[PDB]
Paper text:
M. pneumoniae binds to host target cells by means of a polar structure known as the attachment organelle, and glides in the direction of this differentiated structure at a speed of ~1 µm/s. P1, together with the P40/P90 polypeptides, forms a transmembrane complex called the “Nap”. In the present work, we report the structures of M. pneumoniae proteins P1 and P40/P90 and of complexes of P40/P90 bound to sialylated oligosaccharides.
The structure of the ectodomain from P1 was also studied by single-particle analysis using cryo-EM. The structure of P1 consists of a large N-terminal domain, with Asn60 as the first residue visible in the X-ray and the cryo-EM maps, and a smaller C-terminal domain (residues Gly1395–Asp1521). The cryo-EM and X-ray maps of P1 are well defined for most of the N-terminal domain with the residues clearly identifiable, in general, in both maps. However, from residue Pro1388 to the C-end, a region that includes the hinge between domains and the whole C-terminal domain, the density in the cryo-EM map becomes weak, indicating that there are hinge-like movements between domains. In the crown there are 13 disordered loops, spanning 117 residues, which could not be built. These disordered regions, essentially the same in the X-ray and cryo-EM structures, are spread over the N-terminal domain surface. Together the cryo-EM and X-ray maps provide accurate structural information about the whole P1 ectodomain, proving the mobility of domains with respect to one another and confirming the characteristic presence of a large number of disordered loops.
Author numbering: 60 to 101, 106 to 227, 231 to 261, 272 to 277, 280 to 297, 301 to 336, 349 to 830, 848 to 869, ...
The structure:
Amino acid sequence: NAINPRLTPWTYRNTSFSSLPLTGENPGAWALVRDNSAKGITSQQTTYDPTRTEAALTASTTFALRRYDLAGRALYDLDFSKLNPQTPTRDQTGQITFNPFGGFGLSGAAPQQWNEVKNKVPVEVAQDPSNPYRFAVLLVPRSVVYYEQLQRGLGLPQQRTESGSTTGAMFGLKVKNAEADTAKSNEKLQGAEATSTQRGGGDTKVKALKIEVKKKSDSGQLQLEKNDLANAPIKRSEESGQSVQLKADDFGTALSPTPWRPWLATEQIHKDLPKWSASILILYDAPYARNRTAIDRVDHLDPKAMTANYPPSWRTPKWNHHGLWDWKARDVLLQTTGFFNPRRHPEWFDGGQTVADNEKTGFDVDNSENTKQGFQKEADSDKSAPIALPFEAYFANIGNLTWFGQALLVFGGNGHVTKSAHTAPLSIGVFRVRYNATGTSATVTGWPYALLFSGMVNKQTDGLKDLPFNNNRWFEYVPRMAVAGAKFVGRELVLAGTITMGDTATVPRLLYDELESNLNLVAQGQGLLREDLQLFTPYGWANRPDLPIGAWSSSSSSSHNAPYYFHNNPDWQDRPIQNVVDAFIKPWEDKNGKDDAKYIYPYRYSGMWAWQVYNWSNKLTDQPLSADFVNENAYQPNSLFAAILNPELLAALPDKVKYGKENEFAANEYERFNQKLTVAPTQGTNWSHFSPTLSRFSTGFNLVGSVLDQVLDYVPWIGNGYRYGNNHRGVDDITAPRSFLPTFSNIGVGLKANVQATLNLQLWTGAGWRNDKASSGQSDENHTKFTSATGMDTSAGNPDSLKQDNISKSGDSLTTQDGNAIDQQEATNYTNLPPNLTPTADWPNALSFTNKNNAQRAQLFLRGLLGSIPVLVNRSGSDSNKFQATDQKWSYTDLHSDQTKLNLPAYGEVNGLLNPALVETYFGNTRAGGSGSNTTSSPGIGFKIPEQNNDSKATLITPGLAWTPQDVGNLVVSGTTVSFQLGGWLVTFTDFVKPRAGYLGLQLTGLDASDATQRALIWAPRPWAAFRGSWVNRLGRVESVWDLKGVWADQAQSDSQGSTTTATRNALPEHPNALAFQVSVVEASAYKPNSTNSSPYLHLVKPKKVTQSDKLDDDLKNLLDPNQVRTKLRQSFGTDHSTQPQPQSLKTTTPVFGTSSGNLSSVLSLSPVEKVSGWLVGQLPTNNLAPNTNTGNDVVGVGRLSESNAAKMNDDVDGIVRT
């Protein structure tokens, strides 16, 4: 019985592996086969014990391999549970005894510990490049193949409010402003140093805030005689008696709500390796021999082999290289502490959510004496939770075998094997199995990606510069990947997929008494809102996010402690002229690293998103390991990625990584006050040998950031097929002095700025300009006057009652003025400010006024390919709350006379885009209100500026698509290009191996939402379960396969027909893109103008405190479940012409891309940004779905599937046999 017919093909979800073609000396193929009719493991959910589950799965399932020939016939099967193999014999030279007629010499014994590994199932086969008869098969436990049937979800913290107690917070969020403790009122830092109410003034003197940390030479030693960094005059509030605090029992107690925990710890897997681990076995195969089957050995991929090479700083991930001051600063603000806190990242802790709080850090943080807090503890009852590799993360790291010499590499998979709705298990590193020359012994090791990627610089890429990829010597950046594959394009090892960057969304910190007005950012900081994008709520930020608590309150019992700690306002910043830097910085800047005292200068620092990112993220520089601030890590993969690796070093690295003392957090608080960002590696360590592994990397196009924003506007939304640029007719539109404003570009929007205002050019302002008017009143100026931008008419222009200053030119006397421009001339502030600080601000000549930045452009590119950019809405679109078509205007003729007709919120939405433009792309009200057909079929959702006495109670929502950033296909090669499937888009890195300068660098092909079957695939509740792999044809075109039968099975059963649990129970629905968003409350008086400036966006938009009445409505709280939005949108798409047969599988193929496709040299020979935008609009072509007419086609490489290049099938497919 060679061919078991009860078995049928299948595909392993984690790697898209279905089969392996073979050619040359051993032609044919290998394919996975199983009993596809079994149940697996079997709303009244119950607990499954692991042992009994694995027992029943062994007793009720069957897995094998199937061998084919060059003609496509099945030769035999290999059921490891029923096989009885024999280890093969060798000669004196250790070569496997083989002859093309007799087969292999069988010694008459089984492999070692074979009778305990035989029940594990094969999921991956890779052929040896040095021996076409030697294969490496990967085995996993049976319970891992059916883990998706257990459905163990992540929980929310239990709440006492629902809001739809008080404060209006939803989904369990704890938010409560902090108050000062009158008991510790002495612990405020005094501005001491010297050598004017608007500075340290102790009267009218310029004073810097002095921080001093000193030790006793008397008798964790030195006794820390004084620690200014332990001061805490501001403390967390008390609420119903007991203080508010982030506790791990918020999720329930381990045992109606129960916290999420890993199925098996790292320890249990290490202790039952034969049952619970994953194994590699070597296989010898000759299909035309007498003795054809011989199993050489079996090797285990022990998780501890990886966790033993983790950096030492990963043992206590609740700490960082900022010590105690940052711990208390983040704890008071209701945030998580450390770099990898378990409350944000529970998939890598054996405790799950039973440790998801801020306590037990491995250091003393609540001692009675301020001089004993911050000392690393050796007591073991107070040990922390270390970053580990439990069940789900461990099996997320298993896949993608690759040979090179004697080295067998395991790069990981995308994580769909153990992924849940609101979890994100990922690959943390690489496993290696290295064999000796004879193949008679093997060693197993693993290294984290953090270590292998530790030598990245800026000149190693060709796209965006300054991405948050840097790291430091503590390895606080933990790059995790969703791997597509590792392939050899000639001699180059290419690695590709998506990756987590460092966290930039919560870099800015709010003021301590502004939390209850900025609930969204507080949720992002508590780990409750699993959202990596930057949100636009800049009013309540502090001016800079790196100050200890001692600098927060006041010395005069006033408001916030300006000039040190006040409301962020880039209009109130100083200017970096010589006599100002000499007055405010130079008396002190030469004493910081001196006598153990650092100083905060009375210098006004302020800036928008780009300024915060450029100063407190981990952006890339030209020096490696030079990151001074790693804020946190991302929840999900938020960037496209591709890397080239030196394969010779990967097989030559050490087996065990030796870290030094330069890789640990300091033991006492005096030791880290005298720190250095760089320390040379110590003798007897090799952790610096892993750096040269990366030679080049890519994140997509080869474009400069501002040029990427026209490509992004030319890319359609995969939801309906309308481009994000809204057909905006480039620079020739009416929007300057069927078509709408664009989402990502400024070219043609607003006024034509030729600026010299602050520290020529021919750029634009965009939407939300605040130009002052000129003399007559009709002519417009190129700037905003400081006298207009700062006005007290609490006031959003001057909430902290700042005043002007000036410095008389000798370096001397300060202390007041209106700033006469004669002898005092040099005023501390600016005079002409840029005429924009909205989310669309982009000034190449003023960093403090820019909002768009590369770290956000990469995320917007990825989430725009996934079709899941959150939008801000305050109209539910339902009866009596519809967003009418006349509610929005775009013609600059009307906008110049009134700017609130654009409905730009300028508070609460995503940074970097035009929110009305995204509303127009998603829901299409402007293109709906231009015809009688479909009677405004738009669902009527959107945002409209509030009127006389209405407040805006808005929330962020997702359009409803279910593509995640872990939907990564397998990596295929075709010529000198690499390509893989990413959600619904087939990407192709065309200019990464051999960069052809003057080309875009990428090609995109997506699913066409104007075709019925592809549209059903796009809007499927689980569209990545239908992916069956990609492979290259004979002509050089990449083709993908989809199995649509589950899509039809789900379309046949409606579950969310009338679901209202979102608004009634405040639980997160089981949708992959459900996010615990909050409400943003803005009063109508915020959009009124002030007096030479009539712009509603002159100041920042001040929000309103959130109370138990400021909560959402029910009809709007309903849209927090993406299935309701999905229903409304597909109902707008309403039509019923089902195919019959409703094909069971569909096959897509890339079109033919010419030698002139994606070329920029034809237009790069006006600024290059405007040139590329104009070329795109020249190459650019009333309905709910944009028909794919193929005008947006092979001249750029950005195009969708034609009907002819997407072949449907009649019968479904689980596995694909390729010979």
